[PDB]
């Protein structure tokens, strides 16, 4: 056979850095049921910023090795952020059942991307009790993957309707998390950031830090 002696790589000409900071360094995250979404395009993305931080504890990725992020190039990257309880983080997984998975935020079975969760007791805990966060409790059925359900209709699931007034046999579907620093780790609020990679053959926009070289012909 003939072994090569040369090796080349060509990447897009863009060099500007895009704001991963405004997703992670945001002062306050939106409610889990109405989870915020930020899209990222046309930049070079460095993942060494996220990886080397100690508090970013729960960093487990589906379909992509976390170490290989530094060189892969993606068409587009989505960022979703919200606030959930300590024991509720394990419920963020494709094909797994659970309250937020059922009614708040579900990952599709064919999901690709990484999920990041870290402790947030130093911002989302009030001694009297925080109620700025809401989570949906009642819904007729499971929510579709990557869907945001902000419906505020008063739930009736029984044989006698109330016709939309919270009298007998009707509850408001949205319940507020009661975060307090005294509670244990199992209920201690956490901040979660979910990255979805649209890995495809289309002309990509977001790439990892890499250096191009001369294009060898023959």
């Amino acid at each position, epitope marked *: 056979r003939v072994q090569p002696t040369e090796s080349i790589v060509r990447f897009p000409n863009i060099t500007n850095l895009c704001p991963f900071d405004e997703v992670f360094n945001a002062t306050r995250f939106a409610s889990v049921y109405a989870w915020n979404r930020k899209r990222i395009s046309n930049c070079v993305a460095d993942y060494s910023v996220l990886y080397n931080l100690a508090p970013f504890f729960t960093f487990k990725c589906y379909g992509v090795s976390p170490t290989k992020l530094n060189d892969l190039c993606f068409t587009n990257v989505y960022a979703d952020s919200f606030v959930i309880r300590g024991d509720e983080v394990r419920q963020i997984a494709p094909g797994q059942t659970g309250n937020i998975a059922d009614y708040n935020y579900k990952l599709p079975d064919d999901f690709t991307g990484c999920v990041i969760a870290w402790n947030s*007791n*130093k*911002l*989302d*805990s*009030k001694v*009297s009790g925080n109620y700025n966060y809401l989570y949906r409790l009642f819904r007729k059925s499971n929510l579709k993957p990557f869907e945001r359900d902000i419906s505020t209709e008063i739930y009736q699931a029984g044989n006698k309707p109330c016709n939309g007034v919270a009298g007998f046999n009707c509850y408001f579907p949205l319940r507020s998390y009661s975060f307090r*620093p005294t509670y244990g780790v199992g209920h201690q609020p956490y901040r979660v950031v979910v990255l979805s990679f649209e890995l495809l053959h289309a002309p990509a926009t977001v790439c990892g830090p890499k250096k191009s070289t001369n294009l060898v012909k023959n």
Partner: antibody, heavy 123, light 108 residues
């Protein structure tokens, strides 16, 4: 590197009312909490009042309940502290500290500070 | 109700030494304590937020430690600008943002 300038200090008679203002320019102001803290002439720092990112949650120190009012105006990126019903032991130094989070009573503490403005209550 | 007391009031050292200061809590505060550096010539600033987390922009020489009831700040270099007064604060219990007594640090 943020700038927190304070004014309105001076000397007033007991029972009289004066005003404090603190202007913030080195950081985004509409989503940060703020606190007013007191430095005694010969004792340590003592917390006085606080305000959330929006004027929704308000807390006062125990020693000054029902005497001071803390106001915040986002349009001019400044907060005001109205001083009412003063006594002879509020002659300390008052600092304008900035909280890290957005609530009022959180594990987060005072992040950046500013120069204090002296106040004296006597004749 | 919480109480914080500092064993040292005035500490003596030199330019090239190291000294330690402890802050005790009357009741457990779940490691939510902060150390504030207070020069007498200018506005005080924070050094250590949380139990042992260093706030960005201050020299790495300062390092917080301790969790629960007893907390400690340590300094190893003592550059000649470290003459100041240090305070410990708790932010967990219902008496909000109570402070500890001063800790005068002097260089011999």
């Amino acid at each position: 590197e943020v700038q927190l300038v304070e004014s309105g200090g001076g000397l007033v008679q007991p029972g009289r009312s004066l005003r404090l203002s603190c202007a913030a320019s080195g950081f985004t102001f509409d989503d940060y909490a703020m606190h007013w803290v007191r430095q005694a002439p010969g004792k340590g720092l003592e917390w006085v009042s606080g305000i959330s990112w929006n004027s929704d949650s308000i807390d006062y120190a125990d020693s000054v309940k029902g005497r001071f009012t803390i106001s915040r105006d986002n349009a001019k990126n400044s907060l005001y502290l109205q001083m009412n019903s003063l006594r002879a032991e509020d002659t300390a130094l008052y600092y304008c500290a900035k909280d890290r989070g957005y609530e009022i009573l959180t594990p987060a503490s005072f992040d950046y500070w500013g120069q204090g403005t002296l106040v004296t209550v006597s004749s | 109700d919480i109480q914080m007391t500092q064993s040292p009031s005035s500490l003596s050292a030199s330019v090239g030494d190291r000294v330690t200061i402890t802050c005790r809590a009357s009741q457990s505060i779940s490691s939510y304590l902060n150390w504030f550096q207070h020069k007498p010539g200018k506005a005080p600033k924070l050094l250590i937020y949380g139990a042992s987390s260093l706030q960005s922009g201050v020299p790495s020489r300062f390092s917080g430690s301790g969790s629960g009831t007893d907390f400690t700040l340590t300094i190893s270099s003592l550059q000649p600008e470290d003459f100041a007064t240090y305070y410990c604060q708790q932010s967990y219990s219902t008496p909000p943002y109570t402070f500890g007594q001063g800790t005068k640090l002097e260089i011999k």
